[PDB]
Write a protein that binds this ligand. Structure first.
Ligand SMILES: [Zn+2]
Ligand SMILES: [Zn+2]
Lengths: 138, 144, 114, 138, 36, 97, 134
RNA sequence: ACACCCAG
């Protein structure tokens, strides 16, 4: 119906409790990093111009969807393993995740031989990952 | 930007495409009934009496650039590049987005004439609505 | 008091003196257009700046939720009891601490300063 | 009378393809144009570049009459549409989509200061007096 | 005793800069750098 | 401490010495905006009765309110009362804004 | 008589045309009809002191739209065309300006959300891989 | 070198 004045003190702190149970305390750090990987990183790759090459054969390197995996650690054996946040603090590692890009390469040459080859998930480096974000392991 | 020393505001209006004084003052002065804002734009028109074409306005802008050209067409092309790509990029960077730029530059001077008249209060720098916060999102996107 | 624009090159007219009749002659100094006016005034300046603030007050201000409202001063040509009052608080207005009242009724932008 | 309760009701027709494409003259209200004076109109692309992406040049009544430059609008009609309803003897309105929007501004005809002459004119910055006398020399 | 306290200024008779802007320029001199 | 730091910058917490007043902290309920595309808002405005900026003449601006989306002038409007009532209702319903 | 000459015989006849702005769904429905001959019907009603213009959608196309007028004195608009034979011509001068609105006020929002969903259909975002790529 | 921080 209507919140009475004597019941307002319980009512307002219940509302604030629902905010901090849902949003949290460091939500500005996580939301900005989430928009950076989910939206900004994709936007940079699309906005980047295609590569034109000459010297005649012509090459176009079109970029496509970004794939980002869980933060992994490569040992001396070369065997990948999921990096723990505790292991990064202990063994002085960097809490980074691999960044994979999809690239479609199209060759342009005389003779009606425009071949479109595609390389799936090309490794182009690692991106440090904020803890407790949606792209972290936790 | 990319210009060493200052230029009059009626020059860059004539460089943008609108060269007649009726089109320039229709961009700046929205209502011609009040004489006060028409009075303070009078010295600006008198300063730009020398320039009368668009091309000579582009020549005057390019002659004061950071990189001085050699031929007449060289500094005109350079001045057209800074008039289009580095002048108000948020309004638009395209070959035919010049009417929107002059309206914003018309609103540039109209905000300036209102504050000189005291019609609206000057926007202080320490007002925190005039501030933005760069979190980890926009900062990492600037690196990337 | 006001200067018209050119009918030929769309520039701004400017005063000029002629010796053939000794009459005010607004002449465009870009092209060769000629025009005889009848206002017979060139420049006026409000030195004490007694500008009528009632014209510059926008009539749509009455619906601002952040402005106070009182029923003590009723509308003159509208008859509504309550109205919105505020101060101009602007430069070139000397003291600028005297109330301006705007009626809050729709389709009535009457402003009185009392 | 009949005009007080007039019942007029016409059909709208949208053709699929048309052999002619439609664009727009736009003129300023303060320009005070007159179509009765226009006994000759010439429309051509300007030679300032030296084709489709170039501004249009309109010449009216030759060099004696006024001249205009057509400039395409900055925006695009991706989410907006403009149609022209043309009166016909058959009475069925013909909805014609637009292709592009052009804006026209007049060009003043008079003796204009040369750029080389303008640089000689620029020394008298604020010491310039009798701006009438500038056009007397030119 | 007049309500409109009008004071009239005119330039001398035998007068390359025109008088339409000379009287503008001297009016600014009267209200900036003149001591009553 | 400016007057507009109410509710989203802590008025009490501030370091001492050379840094006083420059290093600030968020309040408890402060939420910094994450950013969004202005395309749905611009699509809604052009769909509405708002006239385009290049469409109008430079004479109807005086009796109309300019519309600014992300600081860019995009057009004018003649009915600002109905526009705010529509825009605020659409944000509360979380339909497009 | 020239290739670059503009024909203005339509302007001499004082031909009157109307410029109308319509939403995307009405243009998409007209495009999907592929011009059968009739896609809608126009209703004009005049009272003793007011004029109302409305557009009625065809019942075949679906399986009201008001045309409230705007001031014309702000600008001067005339319409022309260019042909495949490169013969420039002018039809007439715009006399009345009209704009179209949807009749639904609150139930129109579900069509707008699907349009936003279709607009966000081809946009991409970075995905997540459960396993590192080898 | 820079950040953070103690005292007045
Ligand atoms: Zn003139
Ligand atoms: Zn009233």
């Amino acid at each position: 119906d209507e919140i009475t004045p004597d019941l307002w003190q319980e009512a307002c702190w219940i509302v604030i409790s629902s905010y901090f149970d849902e949003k949290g305390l460091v939500r500005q750090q996580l939301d900005s990093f989430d928009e950076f990987i989910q939206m900004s990183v994709q936007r940079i790759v699309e906005d980047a111009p295609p590569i034109d090459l000459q010297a005649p054969p012509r090459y176009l390197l079109k970029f496509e969807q970004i794939y980002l995996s869980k933060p992994t650690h490569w040992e001396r054996d070369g065997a990948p393993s999921p990096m723990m946040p505790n292991e990064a603090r202990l063994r002085n590692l960097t809490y980074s995740a691999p960044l994979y890009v999809d690239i479609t390469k199209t060759v342009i040459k005389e003779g009606e031989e425009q071949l479109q080859t595609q390389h799936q998930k090309t490794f182009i480096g690692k991106i440090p990952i904020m803890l407790r974000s949606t792209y972290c392991l936790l | 930007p990319y210009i060493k020393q200052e230029v009059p505001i009626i020059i860059v209006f004539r460089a943008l495409g609108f060269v007649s004084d009726r089109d320039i003052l229709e961009h700046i002065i929205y209502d011609f009934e009040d004489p006060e804002m028409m009075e303070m734009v009078k010295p600006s028109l008198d300063e730009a009496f020398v320039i009368q074409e668009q091309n000579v306005a582009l020549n005057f802008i390019g002659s004061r650039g950071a990189k001085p050209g050699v031929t007449k067409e060289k500094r005109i092309k350079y001045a057209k590049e800074v008039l289009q790509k580095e002048m108000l990029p948020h309004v638009g960077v395209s070959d035919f987005c010049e009417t929107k730029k002059a309206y914003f530059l018309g609103y540039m001077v109209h905000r300036l004439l209102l504050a000189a008249l005291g019609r609206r209060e000057l926007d202080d720098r320490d007002h925190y609505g005039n501030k933005r916060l760069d979190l980890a999102g926009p900062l990492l996107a600037f690196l990337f | 008091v006001g200067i018209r624009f050119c009918q030929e090159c769309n520039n701004m007219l400017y005063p000029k003196e002629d010796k053939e009749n000794r009459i005010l002659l607004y002449a465009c100094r870009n092209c060769d257009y000629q025009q005889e006016a009848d206002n017979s005034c060139i420049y006026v300046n409000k030195i004490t700046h007694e500008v009528d603030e009632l014209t510059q007050i926008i009539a749509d201000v009455s619906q601002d939720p952040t402005l106070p409202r009182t029923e003590d001063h009723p509308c003159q040509k509208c008859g509504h009891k309550e109205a919105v009052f505020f101060q101009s608080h602007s430069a070139r207005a000397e003291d600028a601490m005297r109330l301006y009242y705007v009626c809050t009724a729709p389709h009535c932008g009457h402003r009185w300063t009392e | 009378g009949p005009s007080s309760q007039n019942v007029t009701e016409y059909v709208v027709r949208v053709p699929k393809n048309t052999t002619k494409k439609y664009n727009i003259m736009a003129f300023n209200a303060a320009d005070k144009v007159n179509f009765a004076t226009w006994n000759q109109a010439r429309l051509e692309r300007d030679l300032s570049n030296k084709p489709e992406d170039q501004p249009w040049l309109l010449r009216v009544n030759g060099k004696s009459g006024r001249k205009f430059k057509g400039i395409k609008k900055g925006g695009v009609t991706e989410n907006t549409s403009y149609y022209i309803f043309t009166q016909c003897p058959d009475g069925a309105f013909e909805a014609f989509p637009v292709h592009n929007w052009y804006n026209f501004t007049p060009l003043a005809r008079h003796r204009t200061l040369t750029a080389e002459e303008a640089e000689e004119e620029w020394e008298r910055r604020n010491k310039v007096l009798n701006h009438f006398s500038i056009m007397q020399q030119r | 005793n007049a309500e409109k306290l009008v004071l009239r200024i005119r330039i001398m008779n035998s007068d390359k800069m025109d008088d339409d802007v000379f009287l503008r320029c001297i009016e600014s001199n009267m209200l900036t750098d003149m001591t009553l | 401490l400016h007057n507009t730091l109410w509710g989203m910058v802590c008025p009490a917490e501030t370091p001492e010495g050379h840094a006083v007043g420059l290093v600030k902290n968020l309040a408890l309920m402060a939420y910094i905006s994450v950013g969004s595309q202005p395309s749905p808002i611009l699509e809604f405005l052009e769909e509405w009765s708002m006239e385009n900026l290049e469409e109008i003449s430079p004479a109807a601006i005086a009796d109309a309110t300019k519309i600014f989306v992300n600081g860019c002038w995009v057009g004018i409007h003649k009915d600002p009362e109905q526009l705010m009532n529509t825009l605020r209702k659409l944000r509360r319903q979380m339909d497009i804004i | 008589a020239e290739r670059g000459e503009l024909d203005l015989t339509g302007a001499k006849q004082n031909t009157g045309v109307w410029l109308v702005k319509v939403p995307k769904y009405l243009s998409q429905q007209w495009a999907k009809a592929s011009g059968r001959g009739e896609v809608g019907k126009l209703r004009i009603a005049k009272t003793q002191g007011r004029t109302e213009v409305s557009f009625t959608l065809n019942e075949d196309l679906a399986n009201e739209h008001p045309f409230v007028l705007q001031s014309v004195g702000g600008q001067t608009l005339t319409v022309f065309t260019e042909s495949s034979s490169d013969k420039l011509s002018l039809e007439g001068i715009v006399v009345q300006r009209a704009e179209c609105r949807p009749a639904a006020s609150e139930n129109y929002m579900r069509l707008k959300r699907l349009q936003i969903e279709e607009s966000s259909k081809p946009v991409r975002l970075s995905q997540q891989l459960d396993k590192v790529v080898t």
